[PDB]
Amino acid sequence: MKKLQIAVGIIRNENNEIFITRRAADAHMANKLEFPGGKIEMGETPEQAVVRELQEEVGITPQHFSLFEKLEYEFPDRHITLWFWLVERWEGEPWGKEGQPGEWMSLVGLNADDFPPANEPVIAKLKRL
Ligand SMILES: Nc1nc2c([nH]c(=O)n2[C@H]2C[C@H](O)[C@@H](COP(=O)(O)OP(=O)(O)OP(=O)(O)O)O2)c(=O)[nH]1
Ligand SMILES: OC[C@H]1O[C@@](CO)(O[C@H]2O[C@H](CO)[C@@H](O)[C@H](O)[C@H]2O)[C@@H](O)[C@@H]1O
Ligand SMILES: [Mn+2]
Ligand SMILES: [Mn+2]
Numbered sequence: 001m002k003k004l005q006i007a008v009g010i011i012r013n014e015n016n017e018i019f020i021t022r023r024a025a026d027a028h029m030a031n032k033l034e035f036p037g038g039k040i041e042m043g044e045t046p047e048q049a050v051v052r053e054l055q056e057e058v059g060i061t062p063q064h065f066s067l068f069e070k071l072e073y074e075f076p077d078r079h080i081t082l083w084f085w086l087v088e089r090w091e092g093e094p095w096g097k098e099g100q101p102g103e104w105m106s107l108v109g110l111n112a113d114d115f116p117p118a119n120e121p122v123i124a125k126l127k128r129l
């Protein structure tokens, strides 16, 4: 099956809220809440991918970020490796730059059922910060 490397950014403000977008109805993991991110392209690193993806999707440049979690998940029709970067400093103000819904969500109120199942251990670990 398809095998993908995905870089996503956990965008956390000083009020313990995370900037979360909602995936399109015709996408893989349609209508799910998500950390902004996307496919790591040939010739770019995981760190470069999370910067580019957040610039494209929500209009911020992450800086001084860290790898929060790396995990693999087997979906029904594809295998993905997810790189979860914790982003606590950035240039810009995140918004729905690609026309997608985005909003700040309290960390304590996140419901892992709203996200792709691959995010389950990450959402749990975030709540223990
Ligand atoms: N962006 C994102 N994707 C996730 C998360 N959890 C998770 O399992 N995924 C999966 C869903 C997709 O199968 C894949 C993400 O790919 P994507 O749809 O963001 O790819 P992309 O932005 O590069 O796509 P495109 O705009 O180039 O069309 O990883 C998450 O928190 N954020
Ligand atoms: O890989 C993340 C990890 O590396 C450190 C340095 O030890 O940060 C470096 O890499 C980050 C991601 O590219 C950069 O944002 C950062 O500026 C750079 O120092 C750690 O801070 C981080 O845990
Ligand atoms: Mn994208
Ligand atoms: Mn992409």
Ligand SMILES: [Mn+2]
Binding pocket: 036, 037, 038, 039, 057
């Ligand atoms: Mn994406």
